[PDB]
């Protein structure tokens, strides 16, 4: 359920940033923490949506990742969205620490598929 959405968002948010010779993901690994902190502090969903839109405008969230996040958060409750953001943070931290390559895992929409990829290698 929510785990699948989290993997899709994180895998979309791990693609390397363009026009930068440094191999860095398009997200600066602090945007996710900022999103989680903002959601916890405001305890609101519309404010979180506005924050996400601002971050996307500030060239930190791509079109695909922004669209995925907005689609998943337009019709979400408070605690469920908190759980989703926490799962996103955990998945992103796992991907960053494992130093996985976006080419290796690209068209994976299933958390089970991601588990299989991370295990079989």
């Amino acid at each position: 359920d929510l785990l699948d959405i989290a993997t899709r968002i994180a895998i979309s948010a791990i693609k390397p940033k363009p026009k930068s010779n440094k191999p860095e993901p398009y997200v600066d690994s602090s945007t996710i923490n900022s999103l989680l902190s903002f959601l916890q502090s405001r305890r609101n969903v519309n404010e979180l949506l506005l924050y996400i839109m601002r971050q996307a405008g500030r060239d930190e969230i791509d079109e695909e990742t922004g669209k995925l996040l907005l689609a998943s958060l337009k019709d979400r409750e408070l605690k469920d969205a908190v759980n989703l953001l926490g799962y996103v943070k955990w998945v992103y931290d796992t991907l960053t620490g494992l130093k996985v390559n976006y080419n290796n895992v690209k068209g994976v929409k299933t958390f089970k598929e991601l588990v299989n990829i991370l295990s079989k290698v």
Binding site: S34, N46, E47, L49, L50, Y51, M53, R54, A56, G57, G66, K67, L70, A71, K74
Partner: peptide, 30 residues
Amino acid sequence: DVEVMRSVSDVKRLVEDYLSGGNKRIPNNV
């Protein structure tokens, strides 16, 4: 980051501009 002081809640009439349906051209948060 920003602190969003005014906290405009005027997304009822337009919610994220229909998922930002290929416009991305309003100042919005600014």
